[model samples]
Target chain A: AKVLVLYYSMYGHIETMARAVAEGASKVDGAEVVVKRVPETQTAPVATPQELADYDAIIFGTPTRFGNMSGQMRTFLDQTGGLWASGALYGKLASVFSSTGTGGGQEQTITSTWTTLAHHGMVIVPIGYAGTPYGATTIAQPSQEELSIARYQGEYVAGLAVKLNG
Target chain B: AKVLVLYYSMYGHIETMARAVAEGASKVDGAEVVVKRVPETQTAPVATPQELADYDAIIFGTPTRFGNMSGQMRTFLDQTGGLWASGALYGKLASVFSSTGTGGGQEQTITSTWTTLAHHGMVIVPIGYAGTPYGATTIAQPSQEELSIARYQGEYVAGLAVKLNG
Candidate 1:
């Protein structure tokens, strides 16, 4: 599994989205996938610094907070400044997914995560015109259509990663 | 309390909003606020046509589903056809409040309710640009700012209902 699906969820919203992504990723051949939630306290973490740069593709998931990514996810990324400087994650495939309670900032949060990925020079493979176009966003609890969107997005991104990494 | 605050929550988002409306209405002297939940199944009765007409002001709420009110709320409204025919809800002070994940259809849902209220010859009291406008929407749990918007909406409506009822 060359894909790393990372997420931060409070109240299980983002976790639901991450599972959808992983389900889609699992459909692809050779898509070795690991879906893990960010430790509550980023001070001492479950995802080690060395592991972040190891995957061929890293897909991030977060619940929206005030129209952007959650602070915990932001803080987790903050610790990656060392990798950013070392260029260890440059050229890796990257994307983002998010869910909002009603729908204020799902796209904003996804784009916000992309902004961070852009700084690392990772390839930005969003659920573009082919899959979900703007990425999968749900209104709190996802409907069937929303879940399908998330799954399709994950499947497409995993294939893209294998293609890019090869 | 002559104000009827009604809401439906699939996963409790709109329930939180209904409470905010009640809190705001409490600020107004002699403001009688009645909060009620719309039944999920719609197979049974909860809010009756007589009750809909009894209140001086009716504030309805629901989380959006594909840019409209939830099925539960819509079904609840469907049962009010008799009210429309009999003019039971005529001359009532009508308005709406809602919460969304971030954004989608609070304005649409509010307007939709107004459409029903309009057909019944009810007075529409929207929280205009002057008040906490746009009918109180939030992402998941509302922040203080969102709550205040809801409160201001409740206050404005309570005052209007009193002036008209008196």
Candidate 2:
């Protein structure tokens, strides 16, 4: 099964976290991983219904912009109106990860991003933070421990994708 | 002095609330009210800084996306890094209002939007509910009373802005 990792980054911090997540996904046996950046263009391009059909699962990463998802991501989701109407992605597996410059730069806001994905009919997956809950996130300038936690989220999502697809 | 009522609308319900807020702001004698829409282009833009500076106080309106401000609004706030770094908006009167499609939509998450504004050193102006504390809010499918409550929030914010700026 293929897992698509999509993200938008302002500074390089989120890119670092995205790479860590991909690495964790790569460790999973037989998992095909694709990492794509949302266009630098101010507006995100619409993901065609067929484009989504190819992936077994999708993981989204974004920088917390004032306690919410970035505009590009929202624009991207807005384009999915066609998909939502058709229920193209209703059963796909999805998860979210975010990086913020501050300590409480709205982790809840980042989680809200995942909630949007869930509304689209995707099964929401959270990171396996041992004692923590499902969603995985990292602070801007995350500590090594936080980065590791983000990687764990990738692994957890990949594992779920495998089970679901099989 | 002018009060800027800026907001983002996805489903048109927020647009309705924004108009009511503008009407409420107009209720105050000698209060020049300006309501503007955030461009859908980027999450945040640097060009609006000067426009924002012209206002004595600013009220931000947003639709709750998974219990938080729309990504577009957050992005706009994120671009305020320059303003925040310079303390340009420090002490400026600010408040927040949001419309959600669900009751569980993060009202606190909506308020947290203002928390970031507070971090930028802006003074927070809460909704002046008559008997209830804090700012006004309406649930999914707001009733007439809820709409009036939102208008009250608008007037209250305008009054606070007048008092602070005067």
Candidate 3:
């Protein structure tokens, strides 16, 4: 199973979450994990839409900019209009995790990402009944539970991706 | 129901959400709302903890700074510590809504505030099946549904406040 941990970070918080996501994905049997940043974004995000379709699952990590993903991710997503036109990444497993100020901007960011993923026809793996009531989120610092949720989210996405691929 | 909508805003986003909260509260049969802002640290709260007991509900709104609430709101919360000690705000209803850069940061902010309100012994009115499944939230520009949810949240909380006060 091929899995991608795609994300953007400004102050290293989202990076930490991405690593946890990748670590969890690595635990899945036959899981092939590649952690990459989104490309051509203002700061973070070193990936492209051209490469997105190759992975069975994509776990996204972002730092909230407002009530949604940051410009870095947004600009990166704009590049995907071509991908969308081509139906390049449909039916893939996708989910989002994010960090914000100590107040939990992660929820809104994740919620906003879901709106985008829905348009792309990707399956969303919400943190429903997962480790936390909601998906992985954090504030000034990542708590043990947030990290655990990230890991669990990774495993969940990768496991589902593997099954979907089969 | 006498309800106070207290909030802190940096970029006018939280302020907007706060108004929507008040609008919703106004829909209640007997909701009396006083919308006010919390001053900076060591500044005025406009409304004091001592007077908080007069209200049946307080809908708190703020923005995320790094995944947590801004310092101003934290300072505001600090003032309420005395209120907590005296149980002055206990039994009063409380809920939260927030906005972020481009994603929603309100979750962890709400989650974090919930921890504090829990300790204060305040009755938290979570919007379980409100207009929005996750309660009131939005991105940069609130969609119609988001605004509807905010108004519904206001009406719901105020309605409850009226009953609780009665």
lDDT winner among the candidates?
Answer: 3
Winner on lDDT (2 vs 3): 3
lDDT of 2 by residue, B48-161 (tens): 754787777888888766556788888888888778788878888887777754323435545678789888788887654361233455555556776787687778778877
**How does each model score on lDDT?**
0.76, 0.71, 0.77
DockQ class, candidate 1: incorrect
Model 1: DockQ score: 0.03
Give the residue spans of candidate 3 off by over 4 A.
A40-45, A102-104, A131-134, B1-166
DockQ of 3: 0.12
Poorly placed runs, candidate 2 (over 4 Å)? A42-50, A101-104, A131-134, B1-166
Lowest lDDT 10-residue stretch of candidate 2 chain B: B41-50
Per-residue lDDT of candidate 3, residues B92-162 (tens digit): 89887766533234566676777778888988877875322334766646677677777888889999998
Ranking by lDDT: 3, 1, 2
Candidate 3 per-residue C-alpha lDDT over A77-110 given as tens digits, one digit per residue, 9 for 90 to 100 = 7778887887777888888988764323456678
Best candidate (score: DockQ): 3
